[PDB]
Amino acid sequence: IIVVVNGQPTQVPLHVVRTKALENTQNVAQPPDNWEFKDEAGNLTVTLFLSLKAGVAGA
């Protein structure tokens, strides 16, 4: 499994993959609820994506 956490990859139930993915990328600061585990297609060896939600600030 390859989890791309905020663009940064890390090799590792499914909350087990996110927990070690957040521990490996030191991104455990943000609650795990704010993260969205997706597949290479974006659906809520393989490559998975542990990214945040899209943003609102821009002005």
């Binding site: 663009g7 940064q8 659906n43 899209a54 600030a57 821009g58 002005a59």
Partner: protein
């Protein structure tokens, strides 16, 4: 030499640094001399000039003392102009002409300044943004600004992550960046990507003219030979605080319409610029023609961006800055991919405004009273403004002028404008997200890149969105897939919305 808008920059830093204290932070800035150094190679070409322009535009919005270091005599003229640029942003800013006191340094061109401080060589070659910690990387000969400008953003982020390293986690300095803004992969020796700057943007709408839009405008004004009809839509005016983030605003633009600013900034392009000093909804209603071939979105709220998709433009580029991530998403509506509304579909119930407001003010138990005051929009009684200052740990007196005004006013002026933040030495954090200028600028560069690439007809991104975290080492994989909403509740599932789209396009 700290800028008159420094408290807003401190607000932004307070959301990314651990153990933040406002006195500490300004003191830290005051002990810095951030150097921009450059030689004949950088100043002799458009990519060099652009990198330097934006580096200074970003650094002067935060650091109280810069060193402007021309390394040969040809760079001297550019040095004077750069100094004038800095000062037009912060007239009290300090300029050093000597390198001995630099605490960190950015270098454009081919020459090493050989200073005793962390030094980051930045530059570009067309679509490629380049940064090295060890060797000069040079400026290319293209007339595109995307690589050159993105290089400045990465430069400014590394300056910030070097100086404040001890208050960041997993935030090492970048050693090497070679990133193509064409593909968002590592640049390759073959696929340089097309660099012809003669292109036409069609009839494009830029919605929102704030920080992100200033990065885009910065780029669109520096692509010589670009044609197009650009509609620029925002109803607001530049405020002092905005200079923390708005790379094309200086002291002289305080109080200017954001639509007029954007018009002036493009005056020397060949773009046909139509200024709409109105909100999107009023623009859309007066226009009375719902054909929007190309819309760039640079807004602040989910609702405002979703309202744009509701108009059913043919194609949208959406750009954002959030806490630990900036980016762009792209949307055709009838393309099997996620629409812009997909991006903001809510995942479940949340807390109401009365609760979150009550929590911020340190009174999570006067929810009922805050609910009434947000509906009646009545004046906050004296006994209320007294409670709030005590629960927040600040004096009553600075807040007394808000007694009697609407609670929304009291809240968004005292709290969201950072008055309680100053009074508490940065411990009472603002809930409104305030991005760093280098994030706003990069997001806007990427937005003008997408609009340009789209309008040249390039095959579009393999994924919906592209993301960047400038508070960390650049990622190895910036593409971010997003699946269409499958709840059934997004309008891209609606046959009426699909019909209205196919009718137009």
């Amino acid at each position: 030499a700290l800028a008159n808008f420094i408290d807003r920059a401190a607000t932004a830093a307070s959301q990314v640094l651990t153990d933040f204290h406002l006195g500490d932070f300004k003191a830290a800035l005051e002990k810095q001399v951030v150097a921009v150094a450059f030689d004949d190679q950088a100043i002799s070409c458009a990519e060099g000039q652009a990198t330097l322009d934006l580096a200074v535009r970003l650094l002067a919005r935060l650091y109280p003392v810069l060193a402007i270091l021309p390394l040969d005599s040809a760079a001297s003229s550019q040095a004077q102009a750069l100094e004038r640029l800095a000062k037009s942003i912060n007239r009290k800013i300090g300029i050093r002409r000597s390198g001995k006191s630099a605490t960190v340094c950015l270098v454009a061109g081919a020459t090493r300044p050989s200073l005793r401080c962390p030094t980051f060589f930045i530059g570009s070659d067309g679509w490629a943004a380049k940064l090295s910690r060890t060797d000069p990387v040079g400026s290319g000969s293209s007339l595109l600004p995307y690589g050159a400008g993105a290089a400045s953003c990465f430069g400014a982020a590394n300056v910030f992550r070097t100086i404040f390293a001890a208050q960041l986690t997993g935030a090492e300095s970048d050693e090497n960046i070679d990133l193509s803004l064409y593909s968002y992969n590592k640049s390759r020796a073959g696929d340089a990507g097309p660099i012809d700057p003669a292109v036409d943007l069609g009839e494009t709408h830029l919605v929102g003219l704030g920080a992100i839009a200033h990065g885009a405008l910065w780029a669109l004004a520096r692509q010589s030979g670009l044609s197009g009809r650009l509609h620029v839509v925002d109803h607001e005016a530049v405020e002092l605080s905005n200079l923390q983030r708005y790379v094309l605003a200086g002291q002289a633009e305080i109080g200017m319409s954001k639509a007029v600013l954007a018009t002036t900034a493009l005056r020397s392009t060949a773009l046909e610029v139509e200024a709409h000093p109105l909100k999107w909804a009023e623009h859309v209603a007066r226009r009375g023609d719902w054909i929007f071939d190309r819309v760039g979105v640079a807004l602040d709220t989910a609702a405002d961006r979703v309202a744009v998709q509701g108009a059913l433009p043919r194609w949208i580029a959406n750009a954002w800055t959030q806490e630990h991530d900036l980016g762009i998403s792209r949307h055709g509506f009838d393309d099997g991919q996620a629409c812009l509304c997909c991006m903001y579909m809510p995942s479940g119930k949340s807390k109401d405004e009365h609760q979150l407001v009550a929590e911020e003010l340190g009174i999570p138990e006067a929810h009922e009273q805050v609910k009434a005051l947000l509906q009646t929009n009545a004046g906050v009684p004296n006994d209320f403004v007294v409670r709030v200052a005590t629960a927040m740990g600040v004096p009553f007196e600075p807040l007394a002028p808000f007694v009697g005004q609407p609670l929304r006013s009291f809240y968004q002026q005292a709290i969201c404008g950072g008055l309680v933040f100053q009074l508490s030495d940065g411990s009472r954090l603002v809930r409104t997200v305030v991005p760093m200028a280098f994030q706003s600028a990069l997001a806007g560069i990427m937005l003008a890149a997408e609009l340009v690439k789209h309008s040249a007809g390039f095959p579009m991104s393999p994924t919906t969105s592209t993301r960047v975290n400038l508070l960390r080492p650049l990622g190895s994989h910036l593409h971010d897939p997003k699946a269409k909403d499958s709840s059934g509740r997004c309008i891209c599932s609606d046959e009426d919305f699909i019909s209205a789209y196919r009718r137009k396009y």
